[PDB]
Structure formats: C-alpha cells, structure tokens
Enzyme design. Structure first.
Site, PDB file in Angstrom:
ATOM      1  CB  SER A  23      -0.965   0.013   1.190  1.00  0.00           C
ATOM      2  OG  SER A  23      -1.960  -0.998   1.056  1.00  0.00           O
ATOM      3  CD  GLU A  70      -6.349  -8.413  -7.262  1.00  0.00           C
ATOM      4  OE1 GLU A  70      -7.407  -8.843  -6.751  1.00  0.00           O
ATOM      5  OE2 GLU A  70      -6.166  -7.212  -7.558  1.00  0.00           O
ATOM      6  CE  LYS A  85      -1.367   3.856   2.613  1.00  0.00           C
ATOM      7  NZ  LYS A  85      -1.436   2.863   3.753  1.00  0.00           N
ATOM      8  CB  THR A  86       1.964   1.348   7.144  1.00  0.00           C
ATOM      9  OG1 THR A  86       0.541   1.392   7.316  1.00  0.00           O
ATOM     10  CG2 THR A  86       2.623   2.192   8.240  1.00  0.00           C
ATOM     11  N   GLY A  87       2.236  -0.317   4.686  1.00  0.00           N
ATOM     12  CA  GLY A  87       1.712  -1.335   3.797  1.00  0.00           C
ATOM     13  C   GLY A  87       1.964  -2.708   4.394  1.00  0.00           C
TER      14      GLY A  87
HETATM   15  C1  LIG Z   1      -1.765  -2.249   1.567  1.00  0.00           C
HETATM   16  O1  LIG Z   1      -0.653  -2.502   2.030  1.00  0.00           O
HETATM   17  C2  LIG Z   1      -2.831  -3.132   1.705  1.00  0.00           C
HETATM   18  C3  LIG Z   1      -2.709  -4.290   2.467  1.00  0.00           C
HETATM   19  N1  LIG Z   1      -3.594  -5.280   2.570  1.00  0.00           N
HETATM   20  C4  LIG Z   1      -4.822  -5.308   1.758  1.00  0.00           C
HETATM   21  C5  LIG Z   1      -4.467  -5.491   0.279  1.00  0.00           C
HETATM   22  O2  LIG Z   1      -5.060  -4.849  -0.586  1.00  0.00           O
HETATM   23  O3  LIG Z   1      -3.597  -6.293  -0.057  1.00  0.00           O
HETATM   24  C6  LIG Z   1      -5.735  -6.443   2.234  1.00  0.00           C
HETATM   25  C7  LIG Z   1      -7.035  -6.460   1.424  1.00  0.00           C
HETATM   26  C8  LIG Z   1      -5.033  -7.798   2.114  1.00  0.00           C
HETATM   27  S1  LIG Z   1      -6.157  -6.163   3.992  1.00  0.00           S
HETATM   28  O4  LIG Z   1      -6.456  -4.693   3.973  1.00  0.00           O
HETATM   29  O5  LIG Z   1      -4.827  -6.364   4.654  1.00  0.00           O
END
Ligand SMILES: *C(=O)/C=C/N[C@@H](C(=O)O)C(C)(C)S(=O)O
Ligand SMILES: OC[C@H]1O[C@H](O[C@H]2[C@H](O)[C@@H](O)[C@H](OCCCCCCC3CCCCC3)O[C@@H]2CO)[C@H](O)[C@@H](O)[C@@H]1O
Length: 265
Positions: free
Chosen positions: A45, A143, A209-211
């Site tokens: 993200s 994805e 911003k994290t991910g």
């Molecule tokens: C951004 O890093 C998003 C993380 N996770 C989400 C994604 O779109 O991959 C999910 C749907 C798996 S959930 O919000 O963790």
C-alpha cells in the site's frame, strides 16, 4: 537500543527475513543509512503515496481537479474500502479519494484513482517521467500485495522510493500547493499515524504511509524528525519472514528507536 545498522541486522536475524532501509535528509537528499537499499521489495500500500503524486501532477497541468466528483458503483468495490463503501449514493471527489487511499489505505479509492492516471502502466510511466527507472506498478489494488519470491511486479527499492518521495515533496516538479497537499495527506494517516505518535517521545514529527502483504511483507514510508520537523525520509521494507504482524511491527519500531536514540550522524 543499539546503533541503527546493528538493530537492522538484528531484525533480519530475529525475523529470518530481508529488511531494506534508507534514512535520507529530506531537504538535501543526503543518504545517512542504507541497508539493502538497491534490493527490491514489494511496495504494498505504500504505492498510494506515489499514485496521488501522479494525480496531483495532473491537477497542476489542468487535466484534473481535486474537486471533481467521481460516482462509482458497488461492483467497482474491492476488498477493504472503509471510506468508499460509504459513498455509493453520493460519490467522492478526487481529493477525497486520495485522502481515503493514503489516510485509510482504501483500496477502491486507490483503484479509481489508478484508472485516472492510466492504470499500473500509466503510474509506472509517471515514475519514469520523474526519473525513477526502478519502481514499477503492475497490478491493481488487492492483487499487488501477493509478494511472491522472485517476482519483480509491484516492487520498489528503498533508495528509489526515498528519492521518489523526496522528488514529489520537495523538488518543485509538483506545484507548491500540491507539494503541501501530498505532505498533509501523509501527516493525516489514520492507520498508523496516531499509534506511532503514542509511542514517540515528545518533540518528534511523524507523517507516513504503511503497507502489508504476503509472506511477511510489511513496510513504511515516513517523514521523521526531532524539534517537530520533517527532517528525514525513512523507508523500511520487510519481506520473506514468517513472523506475526505484531513482531514485524515491533522490529520496524525497534529500528525507529535506534534512529531516535542515535539521531546525530
Ligand atoms: C496495503 O498494504 C494493503 C494491504 N492489505 C490489503 C491489500 O489490498 O492487499 C488487504 C485487502 C489484504 S487487507 O487490507 O490487509
Ligand atoms: O532518549 C530518547 C528517548 O528514548 C526513549 O524513547 C523511546 C520511546 O519510549 C519508545 O516508545 C520508542 O519506540 C520506537 C517507536 C517508533 C515507532 C515508529 C518508527 C517508524 C518511524 C519512521 C519510519 C520507520 C519507523 O523508542 C524511543 C527511543 O528508544 C524515552 O522514552 C524518551 O523519553 C527519550 O526521549
């Protein structure tokens, strides 16, 4: 805490995964700490910040307006849409979509914005236009976080991401108002911002911003500094670790603690 590089190494030993990190002066680009800075890591993200830099560039050119309202349908929604799922009847402005994508990590908001800049290919072309010849987006939200080993899709490097964020926030490629807007969206992060402030000593500035992704992928792109100033860009990515989310968060926080305790370098 030990010195930054010693703590980074300790995190790889404890997580059994790869950590990528860059600590860079925001105003000059001086690189202070670099560990696996030229190695690839899934952006997850964190790509949402670069996405909104591309949207702002279109606004600056007069090809977009942050005020423009976008109406979408329920069929357009993807997994994790905390803000966008609430506006099926009234829509959201492009600016609201960027705020949702960056401050709430809203995926449908990110996808709606991604289409406006030409999809993954269009965002990648934008990155090439600002001189980032490494970062690449290949998939749409949901994805792009798969994090398969050896898969170059949807990756960046710590060095590339740090330089790109600095270009967007300070190089005058974006207008003054746009630079200020992108920064404020990071300051406004609701996912990790408040939590990080709660554990930061008084006087430390944070914007971020994290991910998160598969196979332990986890990351953060941030602005940090004492005296309530965004002194440095800090980019930390983790990949290929079987550790719990709690421990991945703890190790990233540990690297931050090492930076805080040994800031003058
Ligand atoms: C951004 O890093 C998003 C993380 N996770 C989400 C994604 O779109 O991959 C999910 C749907 C798996 S959930 O919000 O963790
Ligand atoms: O001597 C420095 C400081 O040492 C401690 O502060 C601790 C703090 O109590 C702890 O909560 C934090 O954890 C680190 C939390 C970091 C969270 C996010 C880090 C992000 C930010 C930037 C991008 C990558 C990582 O470490 C600091 C430094 O040891 C003392 O509590 C504080 O009074 C003192 O001023």
């Amino acid at each position: 805490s030990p010195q930054p590089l010693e703590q980074i190494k300790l995190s790889e030993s404890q997580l059994s995964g790869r950590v990528g990190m860059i600590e860079m002066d925001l105003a000059s680009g001086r690189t202070l700490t670099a560990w696996r800075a030229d190695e690839r890591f899934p952006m997850m993200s964190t790509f949402k910040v670069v996405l909104c830099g591309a949207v702002l560039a279109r606004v600056d050119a007069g090809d977009e307006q942050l005020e423009r309202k976008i109406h979408y349908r329920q069929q357009d929604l993807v997994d994790y849409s905390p803000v966008s799922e609430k506006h099926l009847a009234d829509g959201m402005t492009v600016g609201e979509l960027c705020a949702a994508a960056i401050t709430m990590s809203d995926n449908s908001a990110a996808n709606l914005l991604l289409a406006t800049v030409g999809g993954p290919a269009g965002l990648t072309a934008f990155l090439r236009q600002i001189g980032d010849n490494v970062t690449r987006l290949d998939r749409w939200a949901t994805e792009l976080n798969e994090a398969l080993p050896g898969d170059a899709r949807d990756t960046t490097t710590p060095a590339s991401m740090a330089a790109t964020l600095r270009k967007l926030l300070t190089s005058q490629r974006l207008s003054a108002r746009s630079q200020r807007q992108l920064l404020q969206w990071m300051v406004d992060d609701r996912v990790a911002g408040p939590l990080i402030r709660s554990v930061l000593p008084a006087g430390w500035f944070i914007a971020d911003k994290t991910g998160a992704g598969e196979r332990g992928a986890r990351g953060i792109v941030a602005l940090l500094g004492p005296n309530n100033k965004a002194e440095r860009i800090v980019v930390i990515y983790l990949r290929d670790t079987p550790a719990s989310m709690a421990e991945r968060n703890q190790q990233i926080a540990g690297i931050g603690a090492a930076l805080i305790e040994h800031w003058q370098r």
